[PDB]
Amino acid sequence: TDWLGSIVSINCGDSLGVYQGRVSAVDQVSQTISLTRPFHNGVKCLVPEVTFRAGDITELKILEIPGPGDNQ
Structure with missing residues (x-):
């Protein structure tokens, strides 16, 4: 559950492509x-x-790491 609060780019393969956003x-x-x-x-x-x-x-690219506070 460490990804929570990061901003990521998630590639889902040829058929859906790439989504970017906050986790x-x-x-x-x-x-x-x-x-x-x-x-x-x-x-x-x-x-x-x-x-x-x-x-x-x-592929998961980490665009920004989670910040130190409440990411819930």
Whole structure:
């Protein structure tokens, strides 16, 4: 759950491409990671939260590390 509060770029492979955003949630049981207000193709997604399975991610880039405070 260490990714929480970071800003990341998540590549989901050829079919969905790349999403960038703040990590708002991490679910260790379902093995997912949620981005709030993510961008895709240089534009803000219309949906405010998108949740990805870790097993679908081909590359995770850490754009900003979490800050030292409450990231929940």
